[PDB]
């Protein structure tokens, strides 16, 4: 049918500062198998309601996929604020779509901490909706030059999550998938039955 069950049943997953998008088309997707999920800790929707999606056709779904800390899931909602919404992945205040998340402690936590997953800590200004920034520019927090490597008052702009086993449920890794929908009057290769 469609890639959704493979985006969910995926082995590898992306860091939120470099959040990875799938364009969906050519499609006929069963959203009821998604909302039937026993793993999904979160399945928020905005504009739409889960049982309605087999009635709604669309031009395009974007499925956006990334890993964040389990309490930062709060920030993956329309118009929110906090480090992830402000500096990594912003949903617009008029977002239509769904936010799916589940605890991935068994995949993404590693002993002594998994340092492979990162988020952007430093940005001169907040992100626009659906903006992305993959840069490694050394962050000039000082009034003086900083010139390509970190030191006195300047920094590598990413921070590693270090995801531990145990260590409290809100602090465990959560895989997040966001389903976003788009319309310009043409070629609806997405529907239900």
């Amino acid at each position: 049918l469609c890639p959704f069950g493979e985006v969910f049943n995926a082995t590898r997953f992306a860091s939120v500062y470099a959040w990875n998008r799938k364009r969906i088309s050519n499609c006929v997707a069963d959203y009821s198998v998604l909302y039937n999920s026993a793993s999904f800790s979160t399945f928020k929707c905005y504009g739409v309601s889960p049982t309605k999606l087999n009635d709604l056709c669309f031009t395009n779904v974007y499925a956006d996929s990334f890993v964040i800390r389990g309490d930062e899931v709060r920030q993956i909602a329309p118009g929110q604020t906090g480090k992830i919404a402000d500096y990594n992945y912003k949903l617009p205040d008029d977002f239509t779509g769904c936010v799916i998340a589940w605890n991935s402690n068994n995949l993404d936590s590693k002993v002594g901490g998994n340092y492979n997953y990162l988020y952007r800590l430093f940005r001169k200004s907040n992100l626009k909706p659906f903006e992305r920034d993959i840069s490694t520019e050394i962050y000039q927090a000082g009034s003086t030059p900083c010139n390509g490597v970190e030191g006195f008052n300047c920094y590598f702009p990413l921070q590693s999550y270090g995801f531990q086993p145990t260590n409290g449920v809100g602090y465990q890794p959560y895989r997040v998938v966001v389903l976003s929908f788009e319309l310009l009057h043409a070629p609806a290769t997405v529907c239900g039955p």
Epitope: Y87, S125, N126, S143, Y155, G162, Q164, N167, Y171
Partner: antibody, heavy 115, light 108 residues
Framework: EVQVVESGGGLIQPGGSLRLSCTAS????????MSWVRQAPGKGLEWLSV???????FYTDSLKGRFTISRDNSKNTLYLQMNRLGVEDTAIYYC?????????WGQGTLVTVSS | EIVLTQSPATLSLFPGERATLSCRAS??????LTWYQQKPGQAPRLLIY???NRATGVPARFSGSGSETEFTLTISSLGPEDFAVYYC??????????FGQGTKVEIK
């Protein structure tokens, strides 16, 4: 070492309001995470409020709507508008700048509230 | 919300001795914890971050140990200048978060 330097310390009363200020020697206050923290005589540290680099700002439940953090990027300065006080809001207030491995505190400034 | 308990309230060791300062958390806060020094009349100073890393310019005698719900600042030998108040803070919503009530060192 970087010096961050509070100002606007002084006296008020029950009913009234005040506004603190801070400046920084070799860092840009708009680019940094900046907070206010207070320490009353004979009491522990209370973290008050923060402004993130992109201007997002947050507050402790003890003071939501009483105090309001803000900055001016042009003056390289930070402000705590501090309204509707009581006698117990008397403390040293510290301006503090944070980075992942570093936390730079100003010398602190007194505020007192009484008759 | 999280609250932090420090033990002891006042330590009373002599200079030269190895010292341990203890912090316990009302929640499992992972590694997200800070320790600060404070001399009387000075502002606080960062010692330890992420339960265990040592901040730049802090002498190598300081160390951080423990995780999750139980944490300890440890000093390999007290200098006479290490007599101070010490505060833990949870930084699980960095840079925000609650402080401990603090611990002193004093003798006679």
């Amino acid at each position: 070492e970087v010096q961050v330097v509070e100002s606007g310390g002084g006296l008020i009363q029950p009913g009234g309001s005040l506004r603190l200020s801070c400046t920084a020697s070799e860092l840009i206050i708009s680019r940094n995470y900046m907070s206010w923290v207070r320490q009353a005589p004979g009491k522990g540290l209370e973290w008050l409020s923060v402004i993130y680099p992109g201007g997002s700002s947050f507050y402790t439940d003890s003071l939501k709507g009483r105090f309001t953090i803000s900055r001016d990027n042009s003056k390289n300065t930070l402000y705590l508008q501090m309204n509707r006080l009581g006698v117990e809001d008397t403390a040293i207030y510290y301006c503090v700048r944070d980075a992942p491995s570093e936390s730079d505190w100003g010398q602190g400034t007194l505020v007192t509230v009484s008759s | 919300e999280i609250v932090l308990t420090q033990s002891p309230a006042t330590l009373s060791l002599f200079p030269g001795e190895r010292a341990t300062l203890s912090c316990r958390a009302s929640q499992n806060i992972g590694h997200f914890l800070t320790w600060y020094q404070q001399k009387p009349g000075q502002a606080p100073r960062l010692l330890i971050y992420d339960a265990s890393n040592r901040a730049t310019g802090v002498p190598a005698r300081f160390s951080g140990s423990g995780s999750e719900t139980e944490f300890t600042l440890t000093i390999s030998s007290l200098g006479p200048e290490d007599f101070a108040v010490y505060y833990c803070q949870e930084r699980s919503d960095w840079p925000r978060g609650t402080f401990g009530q603090g611990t002193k060192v004093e003798i006679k």
